[PDB]
């Protein structure tokens, strides 16, 4: 499940741009409902940045939805959409951090 998975330090959510004022106005009005930190495996256990980031996303997002819906949530197709993106930027930023430390 999360064996070998670390929780990275918190970081400011990436400001992603979705052209239309609305869907963009959605992220700003819904980001408190999104993560601001990521789960990951030691950066060394991966051959490149893509493998790492890809694993980090599925793990972060999923973990996030199961632990929040447990308290009371509802992630729509958009919520999931705007999340994959956000979390992906964060995972990449996490990759720099980890790699930068090796």
């Amino acid at each position: 499940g999360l064996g070998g998975y670390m929780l990275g330090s918190a970081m400011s959510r990436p400001l992603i741009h979705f052209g239309n004022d609305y869907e963009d106005r959605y992220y700003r009005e819904n980001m408190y409902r999104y993560p601001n930190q990521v789960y990951y495996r030691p950066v060394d256990r991966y051959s490149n940045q893509n493998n790492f980031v890809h694993d980090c996303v599925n793990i972060t997002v999923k973990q996030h939805t199961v632990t929040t819906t447990t308290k009371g949530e509802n992630f729509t197709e958009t919520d999931i959409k705007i999340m994959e993106r956000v979390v992906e930027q964060m995972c990449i930023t996490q990759y720099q951090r980890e790699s930068q430390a090796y």
Binding site: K62, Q63, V66, T70, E73
Partner: protein, 212 residues
């Protein structure tokens, strides 16, 4: 079609165990966490704890961190609530919930050194009202059974409209239940009305034809 179906009713003796199950279907099982809820007779909802359907790690509230086990079977989208060393206090109806929005039909568990008792089903036919309203009301009486619950229907389900099944009542140590059904005076004894009843605990299941 997001549904959660739980295992059938249970009757256990003190000190025995039970493993109630629930099957999800309609959504990605491991994207939502599951909660467990208790409901003693007449009482309100009591949160037992939850399950991280992703990690599989369960979390018990203070009162259930003693004899309760929460587990999964990811492949089958099935969660299990096992209660060990049963106690009379365990008697209640347990629920599984997908997050905080969907529940299972519930599961009634009964714990007592009392032995099962099938219910005696008696039909019930008119005598008074006939055609001063044109309607006719037939009934059915299930009494002296234990434990809860008993399942009843009319004509194996086909007849569901205009039926009234009243909540069971407690006698010495037996529950009695009743149920009415109303139809047009014509359709009876025109059509055949039969009362279907099953008392899981007693592996019993009976039907009663109603006649004048």
């Amino acid at each position: 079609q997001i549904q959660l179906v739980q295992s059938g009713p249970e009757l256990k003796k003190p000190g025995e165990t039970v493993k109630i199950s629930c099957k999800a279907s309609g959504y990605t099982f491991t994207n939502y966490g599951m909660n467990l809820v208790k409901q003693a007779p007449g009482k309100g909802f009591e949160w037992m704890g939850w399950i991280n359907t992703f990690t599989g790690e369960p979390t018990y509230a203070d009162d259930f961190k003693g004899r309760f086990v929460f587990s999964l079977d990811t492949s089958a989208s099935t969660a299990y609530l096992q209660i060990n060393n049963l106690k009379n206090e365990d008697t209640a109806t347990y629920f599984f919930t997908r997050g905080t929005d969907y529940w299972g039909q519930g599961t009634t568990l009964t714990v007592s050194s009392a032995k099962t008792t099938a219910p005696s089903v008696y039909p019930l036919a008119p005598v008074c009202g006939d055609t001063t309203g044109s309607s006719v009301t037939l009934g059915c009486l299930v009494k002296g059974y234990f434990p809860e619950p008993v399942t009843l229907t009319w004509n194996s389900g086909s007849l569901s409209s205009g039926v009234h099944t009243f909540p069971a009542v407690l006698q010495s140590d037996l529950y009695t239940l009743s149920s009415s059904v109303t139809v047009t005076s014509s359709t009876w004894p025109s059509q055949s009305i039969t009362c279907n009843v099953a008392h899981p605990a007693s592996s019993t299941k009976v039907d009663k034809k109603i006649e004048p």
